[model samples]
Each structure stands twice: as C-alpha cells, then as structure tokens.
Target: MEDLIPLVNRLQDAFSAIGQNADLDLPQIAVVGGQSAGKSSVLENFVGRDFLPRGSGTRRPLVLQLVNATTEYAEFLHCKGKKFTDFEEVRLEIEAETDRVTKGISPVPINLRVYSPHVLNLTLVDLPGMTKPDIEFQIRDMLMQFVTKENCLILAVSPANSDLANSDALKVAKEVDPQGQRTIGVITKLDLMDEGTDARDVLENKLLPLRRGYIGVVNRSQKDIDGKKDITAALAAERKFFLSHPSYRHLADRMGTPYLQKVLNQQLTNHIRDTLPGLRNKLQSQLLSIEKEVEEYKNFRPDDPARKTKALLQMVQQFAVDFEKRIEGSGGARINRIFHERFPFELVKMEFDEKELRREISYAIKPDMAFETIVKKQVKKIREPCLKCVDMVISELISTVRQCTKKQYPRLREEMERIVTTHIREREGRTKEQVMLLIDIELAYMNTNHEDFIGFANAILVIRKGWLTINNIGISKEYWFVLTAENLSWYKDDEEKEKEYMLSVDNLKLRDVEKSKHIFALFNTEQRNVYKDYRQLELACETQEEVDSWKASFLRAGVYPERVGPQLERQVETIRNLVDSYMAIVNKTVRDLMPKTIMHLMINNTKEFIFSELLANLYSCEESAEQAQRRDEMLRMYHALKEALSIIGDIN
Candidate 1:
C-alpha cells in the first residue's frame, strides 16, 4: 500500500495541474458493524489514543463517534449529549473532546475521519461492532451512511467466537453490499482462542469456505499474545513467500519486510493471492476512488484532514442519495400523504349519527327492512298519497261554489275553507299509508303527479295577517300546514306546489343537513387537532424519552377550534398519559429489567403504536376495509419504526 502512495501523489499533482482538485478524490474508510465490535477500540488503536466510548456491563455506551479534525486537530462527540445537526457537523462534534461516554446515545455523531497518510488514499473509519444486539437503537442514526453507500469502505468487525454467517450484522452487510464486495470481514479478539489451534484459523476456515472477503483479525494487544508463536511462524512463512514471489515485490518494498512480516505473523494478510490482486485492484479502482465532489458535507476543513473528509463526504453523499431514492421509491411521502389526505374522517360522524338517529327513531319505526331498503321504501310509500290528491283537484275545479251570490257565497267560501284546512292538517300528520291515501286521492282527480293533490285534499283557508284591512275579509290565518304526501303541494293555493318534496319535507323538522354539516365540521376539527398532535409526535419521537416527554408539550399546547376541543383534548391527554406511562416503564425499571434486544424491540413496537394511533385517529371518516387493513400498515410502520429505533439504539 505504501508503494501506491507515490502513485497517489503523482495523480494528485496531475489533478492539481489540470485544475481538478486532486486531493479531493481520496478513498474513505468506515469501520462499521453492530454494537461492541471494538470499532472505537480499533480506531483508538490506529490513532494511538483512547478516545472512543468504553466501559462494561450497564455502563457500556453504544455510540461515541470519533472523527479526526482536518483544519483543527481532533474532536469528539457523544450521541447522548450532542445537539442534533447535519451529518457533517455531527462528525465534527463527535470528534471534539467531552466528558464521560454516553450509553444510549452519544452527545456527538459516530461519523468522522481517521487521518491515515497511507498510499491507498486510506481513511480508516472505526465502525461499531455487530456482535451486540439492540445496537440498532444506539447506532441506527449513523447506520444510514453505511447502509446507503455514503461509507463505501465498510470494515465489519466481529468477534471470533461467533460465525460471521449467523450474525445479523454480516447478513445485513451481505444484503446491503450484495456482491460481498464493498464489505470486508474483520475477526476481532482472535487472541482469545487457545494455543496450537486458534480462533482466527477456525474463523478463516469457515469464512473462506463461504467465499466471503475476510480482511483478517484484530484484538486487543493483551489477548493477541496467546497465538504469538503461530503468528510468528506464519510471519516467517509470509516473509519467505514475499522474497520468492515477484508480484508482491512492490508491496514488500512499500510495507517494508519487517512490517509485512509482522502483519503476516498476526495472520491479518489475505492468503488468497489470486483474489487479493483483484481485491487490491478494486481497492484502487471503483471500490475506492478520489473523486472530489461538492462540499456538501461540512466536516472537512481546508487542511490535511480535508483530504480524507472530502473522500468520506463524497461516499456519504452517494450513499445518502441511494437511501433517499430507495425511501422515495418505497412510496414514502407521496403515498403516505395521499392516504393521509384520503383517510375517511367522516365515517365516524356517520357512524355516530347512525347510532344517535337510529336510537331516536328506532322506536318510531321498526321494519325488517335494511336501513338502505327502508329509506327508499318509505319514500316510495309516502309518494302514494300525492298520487291520490290529483283526482280531488280535478273534481274540485268543476264543482260549483256554494256562494253563487255575493251575500250567500260568504258562508259557502267559509265552509270550503274549513273543510280544506281540516283535511290538509289531518293528512300531514298521518302515517306512510295515510300519506299514500292522500297521494292516491290526488291521483284520482288528475292525470299527472302535480299540485292537483292540494285542491283535491281538504285545504285550510288561512287568511294572511292584516287581511281584513286590505281585502276587507274576516279571517286572518293563512292556510299553513304540512301534509303526509310524499310529494306535497302547497296547502294554501291549489295550483302552487311546495318547492321541495317529502324527503326534504321531514328534513325541515329533523334539520339533518345542518346536523350532518355540524358533525362533519366537528370531525374535521378533531382531525386537525390530531394532525397537530401527530406532528408533535413526529418531531418529538426521535428518542423514546423524547416521545414520552412530548406528551406534556402536547398538553401544554393551548386548545383551538372548539368543535372538537372536548374530544380532542381527551384524546391528547390519553396519548400523553400513554407516552408518559410507556416511558415511565422504560425509565424506571424497564430499562434495567428489559434486555437490550427486547428493549429495542419494545422501542420499535412503541413506534408502531404511535403510528397506528396517529394514523387511525388522524381522520375520523368512513373508509372501506381495504383502506384500513392492519397488515400492510403494520409492515410499513415496522420498517419505519425499525429505522427510527435503529437511530436511537445503534447508530452513533
């Protein structure tokens, strides 16, 4: 790798001459894995420091990301105490110095660069180990860089005790990197193996058979002593091979025979010569690159550290792009917002109305008819009365007035008015069958379904107010009354029909249109509150504690739009109490009682609960079964929840 440095320099100089920022194209390295893979230890070892978070048992922190400062010196950040920022700033903050290491979350980000001035444009990134479970919550926030392709060179560190094939970390690696190309397997704690036969050999045998790219082994120097003899023999063999092998001559010269010997003795060398060259070629080519891109990542400063920062940022940017694409393709915002918009809030209103109105009218009428059928049947039945009225109108038109003379006719008119008024009111209050009688009564007199029913039916003579002064008449009451007719005509005048029919007629009494509108308005207002509640949930939901803390924030927020205030407030309080209770379990004994993995599981589960509640309550309208199914929604929520939990638990 050292011999390649001169080549790198030549390329850099040429790039500078060509007006291309040459140093910007260095390759970046990210030592990534699951929890407790000794990424920080390895990083600290490489940099000759004890900077990354370290402890044992309950005190063992998840993420303490260390990054080398380019313009400055070294900086450290813990996910626990650090304020949230973009990835670059996070990197810088993680690298800056601070107090004790954080357990659940680091005050800083886990992303940073290791200053390796090696020939391979080598920027060593210390990733979290994959062995520990529940790491998803600790390092999940930082895992996107690895999963997305932002970190091209992934050094997955694992323990020798576990088979790389069985570990989820390796599985994820294989899945994300697919070709098993971008990822390199590192077996840590090889020194723990017994003498004579070692963990490294066993692991290597297992991994080689799987045809995976195993870079080598790593362990604390204390444990590394166990296999010193075997390692020394292996070193001698390698040195002999290098002396005889022409292809490795350049590597030997750059690495120096002693250093190469040491590496070989440590059993870290890739023995698969045929693949090594190709792998190294990849390391220098596509898998590794010095492509200077936009300074979108801010961790870099204008100095020696900038080179590696530039490389890391470029790779991170690429990976970020890929992740974004995948997320978008997965029907992220578009589908979510569409469904969110379309979810039926009105269903609840109708449901409530159906319940209320049905209760009110249930005793009034109880046919075996289904609700739909009954409504239609009733409308039809009531129409029957109007049909009866037409015959009467026609008959009355031809009948002679009792008042043939002005003096005698007053009594006749009065008699006619009295008869009509009584008939109209009587018909108005009758049952559907009675209304049908009225409709049939009108139908008997006229050929068409028209106002003939009014005249045919007995009409009320309601004299208008002030009638005596204007018309010099006696009666002041106009013929004002309702009818049982399905399609009613005006009771006052024979020719004039009511503007609306019985469907609308009863509605005047029920005022259902206004009621429905009120219910709808109330429902809408409730949903808006839910939306604001949801946003609060979203914004405050990054950490479990945050989610719990947000309930108070939600309650503290003032009420608005009183239509749904009572109900909405009740819901908010319920949610707040739920979150608080959930977190109380966690903060109190649950954190201690629950295993890390199970806690992470619960965290994910809790997220699902939030999503379900928020989405379910977002709109209180009607929806089909397909729209409200739990299966698909749960899966989607699972993935998203996993991502969120991954950040809180695993990512540094």
Candidate 2:
C-alpha cells in the first residue's frame, strides 16, 4: 500500500529482464481520443515535452507505452529493444517501426517506453486517435487491449467544442466499461469552446456523467505548436487560463494535467495493492506445481546410478511392505474385514444343510434290502455331499480373493497382473489341491471307528431300558443294541473279510429290529391296561398335588408305546435319527473348515509369494534397445522441464 507503483515497476523490470511476458495486468490509465481531439497535447503536457508528432493530415496511428523514469534526459525503447536517446530520433524510429510492422499503408503498435525526469512515476498506454476506417479500427484494437484488463483505467479524451454525446473515446470506453467504474472523462480544448458557453458544467458532471468524474485541460493549439512554445510555459498558461476564466475559475485546481496525473498515480497504486495478494497466490501455486513436476524426474538423474538403483530398490521394498500390511489387516480395514470375517460367513452359510443330509439318508434306506447294504449306502450318500461342499467353499474363497486383490491394486493394474498371476493364483491352486486331497483321503477309508457310534447306540439303549422299566416289563440288558466291532462293518476290499463283516452286520441289524418288534407287540397288548391304570390313578388322587404327580408319571410312560411292534419300530427309528444327526454335523464341520484352511494357505501366503516370486527379478534390465531408447527420451524431457523451471527459479 506504501506507493506500490515503485514495487510494480520493480516487478515489471524483474520479469522483463528475462524477456518474459509479464502480463501482471496491473492498473494503468489509457489515453484515447478521436482525430485532433488534443490527445497528443494532453500526454505531452503531462510529460512536459513536445515528443508526439503533430500536424494536420498526419495520423498518430502508432500505439506507445510511456513509462516514467527519473532520467536527466528523455530516452525511448521502441519495438523489441530498439532504444533511442534523442526525442526527434525517437519520433522517426516510431514511424519506421510502425511502417515495418504495418506495411506502410496500415498501422500497428510502436511499443515505446519513454523515461524522463519531468514525468511522474506512471505507465500509460497511448493509443492512436480515432480516424478513417483503418485508423479507427487500429485505435480501437489498441484500446481494447488495455481496457479489457481488469485493473486498467480508461482516460476518455474529447474536445469541449464537440457535443459530449458525440465523443468516440467515451463511446469505446463505455463499450469496455459500460458502468464507467474504471473510466475517467478528460475534456480537452476548453479554450476553443463556443462563446457564451463553457465546459464548466460538463466538468462538474452536469452535462456528461462518469463514475470516476472528469477533468478539463487546455492543450496547445496547432499555432502554438508551430511557434515552438515551451511545454513547461504552455502548461503554466493552460493552468492560468482555467483560473482566470469566469465560468471555470473556482474549478482551476481540478482542470489541469497535474490534477489528472495525481488522480491516476493514486488510482494505479491502490489497484496494484488490491490485486497483489491474488498475484502472489497464483505465483506460489504455479511454483508448487512446477516443483512437484520436477520431483517426478528425481529418478531420472544422470551420473547417479547408485542412488537411482537404491531408489528403485526402495520402491520395490515399499510395495512389499504394503502388500504384507494388506494381508495382516493393517493396510485396509475393509478388505481385512472381508477376508477375516465377512467372507468366512459367506462360506459358512453355503455349508451343506443338516436337513438335506437326513433326507438323503431316508432315501438310501431300502424296504427289502439286507441291513448291512442299507447302512453302507446311507453313510456313502452322507459322505458324497461333503465333496460338493468342499468344492463350493474353496471356489467361493478363490473368487473373493480375486475380487479383493483387484480392488487393492487398482492404481497399479499393470504391475498387479504380473504379481497376481505369479503369487495369488498359484497360491490358490496349491491350497485347492491340499483341500481336495484331504477330502479324497477321508473318503477313501471309511471311519466307522468313531467312538460317537458306541455312545449313540448306548444312548438309544438307555432310552429303551427306561421305557421297559416304566411299562413294568422288567428291564433286560440283552434287549439293548450295542455298536461293537463284531456287529459293525468297516467296508474293505478283502473278499473273505468283507463277507464275514457283512454277515455280522446283517445279523446285528436283524436281531436289533426283532428285539424292538417284540417290545412293540407287548406294548400293544397292555395299551388298554396302561391307559386304564393312568385314569384310575388320576381318579384316585383326592388332592391336586397327587393328581399332578400321577399325571407327570403317566406322560413319562406315554413315550413308550403300549404295542410291541410299534415299540420295536420306534427303537430302530431312534438309532437311525442318531446316525443321521451325527453325519450332518460332520459334513457341516468339514464344509466350514475347508474355506478357512484354504484362506490360511492362500491369502495369508500371498505376500510372501509375491515378494519371493513376482518381485525377485523385477528390476532386471533385459529389455530391447527400443525400450532403453525410450528411457533415454524420458531423461531428455526431464532436462527440458528443468531448464524451463530454472527461469521460474529466477523469479524469487
């Protein structure tokens, strides 16, 4: 805020030193007018010089950038570093430069920078006055450049003799700033106004309105120019004319070029301060972006092969660590939960149902078959479903692992493919083989050897014994069936031994059924007597306690049938239910166990497999010459980008 004009000029100098286009778009006052509207007089008065070429029929078509400098004498920089010291030569050079750029007939900009001690610290873009079609368009094009810049202030110059409404400068200025927010009106040739009428009302915003208000200046006439009037003396005369005028005397201080210069100087300084923070942020953002781009080229440094190799190895090590963390439930919580909990639940839910096993067992029983054949077929069917359960759980796990792996390495899919092929897929294959082998080994040899069979047989026997004791049929130990080595058959290929085992198993099955039938027949005959006694006990109980106790005993007796045939059938059915239940639990336990075993073998081992197999030889430089050539091309781009960044580094 403390005179930012100097800071702005310093910034301009700094950027311009490197031939960079510093379009900071900082604020400036653009001086514009129609032909002979005294535009040259206004600018020359501000600078205290006769520098602008002035004459009738001669056009001021070239655009000049006049920057104030504290120099003893005036100097000019025209058209891409062309410098001139003498004011006459500067005028001649502007003509030659405009001719060169515009091909003599047309007009183009003569970018001239003027430095002199007489001028204030300011930068102004001087556009050609509005003229013929070519001159008008050229002037408009130059004005548009400065006017459209957000910080630019337009100085619309017009002659007081002409109608303020007919001013071309204000018309174009309004085109860029219709609201007049940054447009300041400058009324010229106040002395040339028609008699009895003055520009006092116009200057006071009574005639023409603008947002930044207006200023009136008396520029040297053509006659004054031809007579070689000193610019300094003319400026003093112009000020005196305004102070002495009957209509403008009170507004003298606000009517001259000095007032306009002060207004522009303060306006440009405030404009720069207001926009400085945004410029700083944009520059900092650009710097950070370039720095990040340069960082990507760190591995491309030449003459640092050892460090480059170390960096490459470090990248691989980091990937290995990330891979391990994923397996250990540390890298990603979502995938870890899927692997450790959710996925297992899915596999467990897919387990074979107990009801399904029972149904299969029922279907395997034949009405007229030998007992050994029925037992063999029922157990075989129960075991067959386990193979299907194993297949389902393993397949589901493999699919889930594949899905999670794809998600985990989505950003590095090219590398993921090689890693997964060598690690995850291969590991899953081994796990599947191990699981299948366990199922095969289990099915190959029947284990009627489980001690649960004896316990199950004894459990059924105890229920029957209690039923006999409750029936007053004297509990007989010999009536209870026991699953012993002599009665049960462990199916094998030895012909003689198989026959002996089958004969023994069939005998046990038949005897067991016969004993049950005998008990069922006895129960059938005593069915009426048992119910009669149950009712008699209920009737004889005089108190509610006696009745309740007697009723509880009667219901206990009801579990056993009154008929012997049904009792035998019920006993055999009890053993069948027990066998079916046991097989169901075994099948489900195996189904649930397989996926976990496979997960441990596959998913848990994936990180190790990837590290040892996929990445072991990843850095080998066994590529074609073309691949090496492309790598070198990458290095070339790095250097090119670094060179560009060096220019940015010069800024700070």
Candidate 3:
C-alpha cells in the first residue's frame, strides 16, 4: 500500500493536468459513433445549448463539418488563395467543389481567423456520423484529416439495449473505433426505453458485454428518464472501475469471496443434510471409502499395496487437470465473444488515389489519333455550322436590342431635357462651335453602342488547349455581326432584372444584417469552445511541456503579451501552496465532524477534503478568468484552479 503512494501522486498530477486544461478553449472531448447515435444531443447537453448545424432547413445526408460560427461576422472570402477582408462579413464558400456534392462542407486545412477573444483559442469540429450512406466512403477519408492516431479521444454513444444486439450497430462502432480501448460508449436515450423494461436488470444482462470493455458504454438512459442523478452517478462510478478492470481475474475473487464464505459457513451443510438424506449418505460413503483405502495402504506391504495406490493418485491428478482446462477454455471463449460483440475494431477513412488521377490525366492528353489528320477534317466540317449558329444568336440579340432602345429612348430624352436647362446659361457665353459640340455630345452618348460604330469587331479565335477549347474557335468571323446584335439585346433584359433585384428589400441591408448576425453567432459559439479549451488545458497540465504548450497556444492566439506574457513553468508546489493555505482549514473541520471510530479515518478524510477544495478552487479560477485582461491570463488562472482540485482528490 505504501509503495503505491508515488504512483498515486503521479496519477493525481495527470488528472490535475486534465482538470486545469479543461478550462482552456480547446475541445477536450470528441463525441463519436455511428449516424444518429445521439452525438449531437450529447454535445448539446455538455455545452448547454443547441449547436445543431445543418446545411439547409431540410436535413442533408452528407458529412457537414460544423464549427461554432462566430458572433462577429468574419468576412468569408471566396478566393483561390488565402485571403481575408475584414474579420466580419464571414461567408461559407467552397473550399473545394468536387464534381459531385456528396459532402456539404469539407474541413478547411487551417483554422479560421476571428476577432472575438472569447472563442479565439477554443474550436470544435462536428464530424458526420460513421454511417452516412451517400458519403460513407469519403467519411473515413475526411475524418482522417482531423482525427489522427494521437490527440483525438473517442466518445462513442451507443443506442439502448433494444437496439444494441444488432450487428450493424456493432459494425458501425468498430468502423469508427477498431480498438475498443479509446471508445467510451454512452448508452443514450434510456428514457425512451423506460416504458416496459427494468432498467438495471436489462442493463445487467443486455449490456454486460459492454461493461467488460469489450464494449465501452454507460447506462445513462435510466438515470435520465427517472430524473435521478444517483443511479447515473453509481453507473458512472462503475464505469471508472471498468476502465481498469482485468482481462481475466488473476487475484482473489474480491467481489465474490465474501458472499461465498457466508454461504459455506452458515447454510450449505445444513441444507445438504435436511433436503436430501440419500445424498448425504452417499457423501459419507465416498468419504469413508477414501479413509478405508488410505488405512489399508498404510498397513499393507510395500510391493502389494503401493502399485494400486499410485494408480489411484494418477487418475485423480488427470481428472483435476482436465477439469481445470475445460473451465479456463470456456472462460476465455466467453470473454472473446463479448469483446467482438462490443468493439469490432475497424480502420479509418482513406483518400482517392493520386497516382490513378495522374494516369487518367495523361491518358486524356495523349490521344492515339494523329492530331493533324483529326484537326484538318474536323475544322473544315465545323465551319458551316459555327457560322450559322453565330448568325442566329446575333439576329436574336439585334432584334431584342432594337425593341428595348425604342421604348427606353423616350425616358432618356426627358432626363436629357432637365440636364440641358442647367447648362442653358453657360451656353449663352460659349462660342457657336462649342455650343454645337455640347449638343452633339448629348445626342451621340444617348443610347449608342460606340464600340460597334468604331469598327471594333474581332472574330473569337478557338484553339484546342485541351478537351474544351480555351478560346472560342470554329465560329466564322462573318457571323460575328449577327452575334453582336443578340448579345446587345440579351443585355437589355439582364439589366432590368439586375436593377430590380438590387433595389428589392430582400437584397438590401436588412437581409445582409440578418445573415451577418447568423454568421457571427457561429463565430461566438466557436469562441466559447476556445475558452473552454484554454480553461481545460490549464487544469489538465501536470508537466512543463503541457503547460508550455498551453501558454504558447495562447500567445499564438494573439492574446496581449503585456498581460498574458510568455510561457511560465508550473509546479505541484503552486497547487500545494494553495491547498495548504485555503484547503487545510476545510480539512480540519471535516475531520472533527467524523466519528471517533471511523474505519478509514485519515485516508478517507484526506480524500474528501481534497475533492471539495479542488472544486472550490476551480470555481475560483472561473471567476478569475472573467476578470483577467488577457485571454491567456484568464485561461491560465482558470486551469490552475481546476488542477488543484483534481490533485487533492487523487491524493486521497
């Protein structure tokens, strides 16, 4: 017991590190599982809000990466390169648009920029469920981008017992987490199952496989339905034990031994005698046969009796060995069956083959036919059709343009008359040539296509840059005149529609404001996640590396240097100091309150004190986080408070 002290200290330190880090803006947990496994609800419960983000009002069956959109709209630039306008006006444009719209939003490689400090450090990425039919192939591929071997922790929420036994459910679980170790199954929506079944009994039999770490799950539905925290707490406590439970029992049967001893000492012999006299007599016969045989062997000559005794002993030994083998074999098989049922371990997602893509590109470019031969005949054949098509398009444009100008010219004349009055007085002083020039300017500019009159027409030249021509080609220059008329007339309808759309209320400031607000709300949500991450880190760190990383991350996050400063190494000593000064007082009080004959006085009191003090310290840190000027300072203090609480609990 004494030897375990150092180990306890180390664990306490680790847990403290976790608690400290909890307050950091980093997303400390990842809710993962099959589609519709209650991940969204679990996340909402943890965050205390509805963070569901769907692509449209209608549910899309594709993988959509959801981050907390900022409360402040950050301008979403739609550029091929990395560029941003103001940190407001954020938009969601295509990171990459494949030929197919299998996924709604692909995760961007880099973190997005935002102005709000609250979510500056924290970030959450909501992944699609493991079983999206349309994008199932790409789901694993895209998940690999963010959820790598290290760093990501899996929180698997499984459906209740009624749905648990099915192979598909287990298959999805295995696909997401091939290794059962990291996957923690949350038995969700227990409330729904409360109508007919006994919660505890159902969980005991149905979820037994899961309880053994062959499946990692929590019986949360029961507690949720009854509105009782105690049952959930008890189950949660049991889960903690399961996390470290043995693959096979090697030590004494601690949970079973006491009950077995009571039964043997108080009830078994009496029950055997009273319930069956014949069975009792048989037992007495077997005992006497063994005793008489032993006595006869002891009194007999060595050569006469020793051979028979040796045979008897050998037979007994063989029987014992075979029985032991059978028991062990059966136990092992059961354990294995349960393991596979709980965690079917699967591989992660993969990407498209770049080598294959390159091969396809090369094949496309290197056509077998001789280029000159194909082009010579193709060009000749295309000439007539190209000329006719262009002539038709141009004719349509010219007719439309002429009709639009005929009606629009009258309106322009009225505006021109008003403008001419302003220039009336100036016209009186001007020379006759200058006055004539002004009149000509008004007439020429009214509605004329100046470029058309200036002989600016040039035929669009087409050259085969690839499968699709880069420049328009094969259309005859003779038909260019016709295409011009159609182009001008088409522009007339387009101009009117553009004017109407631009002036409509739906396209004005009110709509823009609403969209901006929605985008900003997302950003704010992201900021809150960051804040939690920072706070979590502060609490969770026990080592200098983790602490240093936390501080460095805050610095990288653009927290003010003057307030948050550079990275500072933390020690158990700092927490120890806090505990001794503030926590000791509570300890002494609780100690006095306990009974004098308490079975585990010193150790138990120490554990309780540490646990309580640690929580108090965490709340203190939260308070400090609100007051600190720099985001880094706030995060650091927030984490320290949490770490202190965990360390105390661990020591106990």
Candidate 4:
C-alpha cells in the first residue's frame, strides 16, 4: 500500500523528465468543481497545508502531490532546491510563477509536490472553476481532457449547501464518465448543507450513486481565513461534526481524510496493477520500432552542419574500406574460374570447319591472298567470347557491390547502386573495345620466323631439314635445309642465323636416285634433266623414311581449306594444317590479352575511380541538392521511459 503511491510518484517524476512527453494514463486524482465549491480547499486539505495562493490570484489546471514527510515546507519544480519553508512564501511563488508561465489557467498542468508530517500520501490534479462563453468551450475542452481518460479517477467536489442538482462538476463528470466507475465525489461544507439539514443521503450513496463512494468534507468559513485561524483548529471541527452528526454518527469510523486515504490508495493500486502489463507491452514495442527506424539514421547528424558533413563523409569512407576488403581478399572465385577454367574451355571449343575452309581457300587463286581473308574472318570470331567476358565480369562486379552495401543507408540505396552500375557499364564500352582491338591486332599479321612452325609442317606435311646438292653440278655442302610443301629453305648453319638460299618447289619434279634408296632427286620439271639444265638437286638422307618425307613435303608445299573427304588431297590438306596452327596462335594470344584488357579498361579503373565516383555521384548537385534530411534527443525521451521501466520493474 505504501509503495504503490511511491511507485506512482516514481513514474510521475520519470515522465516529468521529458515533461510528460509519453502521455501514459497512470493512476492519478483529478479534483473538479465550480468556482466557490472548495476544489482548491479540498487539495489543501489533502496536503494539510495552506499551499495554494491564498487571498487573490491565478487558477491554473494544477497537479498537487501530497507526500507524507518531515517537510512541513513547499518545493516548486521550476525552482528546485529553493524550498518555501513558510506557507506565506509558498503562496507568493505560486502566483508569481503562474503569472509568468501561463494565463494562470492553461490546461498545461503545473506540477507541485507538497510534503508534511500532517499529511497522508496522495496526488490530485486541481482544475479551475469549470462551470462558463468562448471561455466556456475552452474550459469544457480542458475538463474533458482529464475526465474522458478511462483511467483518471475523478474527484468531483461540490458544496453541500446546494441541492445535488446544482453541482455542475458532478453533471460534467457524469457526461464523460457515464458509468461513474472512476468518479468519486467529495461533498464539502458538510456543516452548512440546507442550513439545519445534513448530507445524509449524499454521504450514504443514496442521492446519487457513484463507482467510488462519495464522502463529505469540512472547510472553515470566510471568517476563518479573515480571522487567521489555522487548519489544525479547522480540522478538529471536522472530527467533532462527523462524530456528532444527525445522519453521520453510524458511519463515523469510515468517514473523512483519516479513513479515506486507505480506500483511495487501494482503488488506484488495483487500477495500476490491472493496467501495468499492457503499459509495459505498449512501450516496449514502441521503443523497439523506434529503435529500428533510428538505425537508418544512426550515423547521421541532422541538425549540426559540421558534424552532419563529418558523418556523411564517414559513411562514404566506410563503403570504400568495405569494398576494398572484399576485392582484395575474398572477392571472386567466379572471376578466378573465368580466367583459369571457362576461358580455356571456350577457346578449345572453337571449331574449324573444313568445308568453310575449302570454299574460302579455293576461292582465291593464290594461298597468300586466300590466307589473309580467311584468317581475318576467323580471328574476328574470337571477339564474341571476349566481349562476353566483359559482360560477365560486369555481372560479377555488380553482384559483389550489392552484397557489400546491403542493409544500410536505406534512403541512399537505390541511387547509389544506380550510379555505381552505370559507371561500370560505361567501362564495358571501353573494355570490349580493347578486347576487339586485341584480336584485330593478332590478325594484323603473322610470324613465320619460328623454327617451331617448320617443325609443325614436319609432323603434318612430312617436311624435313638437311643438306643437299644439285645433280653433278653443285658441290655437296652440309647446309641446314628446311623443306615444306610450298618452299624449301636452308641455312648455312643449324641456328639459321646465316641464310644460304631458298627456292619454290612448284616448278621442281621428284624422282628416285638409282644408286641408293635413301636418296631423292629433284629437277626443273619435264623441261630439263641432269645434262640439259644439269639440275637434279640430289637430297640424300640417312633413312628411307626421310626420302619419303622429303618427297611428300615437296608435293604439299606445291599444293594446299575444304569440304567432303575422309582424307584431304595433299594440296587441300596442307592448307588446312597451316591454318590449324595459325588458329592456335590466335587462341593463346586472345586468352592472355583479354584478361588484361578487362583489368585495365574495365576492372582496375572501377577500383581506382569508383570510390571517387560514388562520393561524387551521391553528393552531386542531383543528390546533395535533393538536400540532406533526429532520433538522438529521442534517446532522452526513450531513456526517460527506459529508466521508468526499470524503476517500475523494481516495484516487486
């Protein structure tokens, strides 16, 4: 019972921290009556002090909290620590502060706490004389503000001298509180009702029934304050009147302030107890949602321009660090696999159709003219996969930024991604351009100087390398010779640093030398043999296979893409072998260069310049000009309630 009012006062003070910003309907008393019906007197009676402005002054909607203490003094919240030790000084402060803050009667209730050993613990909101013009509407609105609340315990005060019908306070309270479930009447001047008659029916709940029963109270007459008679003497008159009353004697034990405190205390305790759980849930969920909303603006400073700029800069810097962290460390297995695995697979799958080659190759009368057109067409096809490379890397790059910036800056999310993706997409135009130029550069020309290509013809065209002499004319010399289907070239030494001579095999004819199976003879066609042109070039080898190899290379070198056969004619087949070898060179070149192009023209610049672009785009005249848009002081509001919940929780 004791902790209940103290518990309410604890919550009351907590709310006052934010000046009741959270208007929770906690248990409280509201004293309402007409101008002269002793409403202020009733509140003074609760505090056992003449604490209200006494003679002539303001009449604000007021909260009077009576705390039982050794205070025998007064304290105003606006002037904390300045105690009004004398009731005289207390009255002056009330009028002085009232005239300063409000028109003396604003519905913004002034809170006052009074403590005296003579008082029992209680709290009441004392309303102005409510019974009015344009003034009538204003007072009515204020009246309903307290009365309409389902939890407010309305203490309807009226003079006993009037007929119960004359108590306008009761009628107004009844209008809002239809059931009277929370209305408790206090009939003042029990000594004066109907002159010689007593408030018997009113006291006994007979005249008008109420949810909480009415009780009669006493107040000294005008002569009392005029004569300077204090309340201790007036209170003694109340005990005597009730004990000796014509209608009240039987109920004396249950009458007046002495017994009233316990009942009022119990009434509100039960009220708060029943309502406590729901209040807890309402505030907790509200706080949870408020906190979630606040997280979006967590790093922002809305009002201070300096810190606001600082916070925005910090957020942008945060993304730069996060993006780099992902990029440098664990950014892409997919990107890694694209370069190492998928790229090679696509290149290897490049097809060389013999029919296409045959048509193209045969279309040109000369292999030189035909090779250039055919090679260019095929090499351009490599661009398809390289461009596809830029597209997917763009996809991967876009995908990663999405993951990195996922849940924060809700307001900036859409446009930030829009700007970033646009920049990377712009990079694609350049990246793909570089990839195409790379393949075109490969098609720019070919290198025929590699000894390796001679080896390729050896395996495919039955080409060979050695030394030889013309039939009985030129002396035999150990020359490093290379023989292919179209040409035979030789070097003065194995390294080929020194050139000997080269000739076309197109006009040469092959024959077996009679002396040895390991030797072959070539002469200048049917037009001449040995003595006539004296020109049988005798190419002798160490093996019969070598002689065979030399003859076939001569045939292919003279002959050359294609269509329908299990085996190609040497002429068509040789052209195909050289073309196959050329494609391999193109494939290796593109595979290596495309990744470099993506890095330079696409990926690297995004890394280097994207951070700058994000800062620029987000703060561009478009975005920053959209203007920057306070949950912190709400922490004062929240923590105010937060501390309240803790104290309320401790009420166990």
Ranking by TM-score: 4, 2, 1, 3
- What Cα-based lDDT does every candidate model obtain? 0.33, 0.52, 0.30, 0.65
lDDT tens per residue, model 1, 198-279: 4433233344332334533343343234421223434344445445444434333322224522332222223222233433
Q: Write the per-residue lDDT of candidate 2 for residues 1-652, one digit (tens) a residue.
A: 5556655554443333332222335445666766558677777676766667655332433334445666724444333454556666665565655556452333233334567667766766566667646655655664676677776777888888777777878888888988768888888876566785575777888656787888888776533545444666677886788888788888888878788888777876777666665656554555566456557657545557786467447555665665555445523433333233222223323333355644544554522232234334544443343344334433444343344444422334446455555555566567766765665554454455554463235432111111111123233211112123333222233232332111122211110112222222111232333222331101222244322222222222232112113354554455565555445555555545764675576555765565655455555422346755645544443343333334333333
Model 3 regions more than 4 Å off:
1-28, 54-125, 130-132, 144-151, 167-170, 175-179, 197-652
lDDT of 2: 0.52
Q: Give per-candidate clash totals.
A: 96, 12, 72, 14
Q: Candidate 4: minimum summed lDDT over ten consecutive residues — where?
A: 559-568
lDDT for model 3 comes to: 0.30
Q: How high is each candidate's TM-score?
A: 0.29, 0.46, 0.22, 0.49
User: Candidate 3 at residue 86, lDDT?
Assistant: 28
Rank candidates by lDDT, best first: 4, 2, 1, 3
* The candidate that achieves the highest TM-score relative to the unseen native structure: 4
Candidate 3 RMSD to the correct structure: 45.9
TM-score: model 4 vs. ground truth: 0.49
Model 4 spans > 4 angstroms off: 55-58, 196-199, 222-229, 300-633
Per-candidate alpha-carbon RMSD to the true structure: 31.9, 21.8, 45.9, 25.5
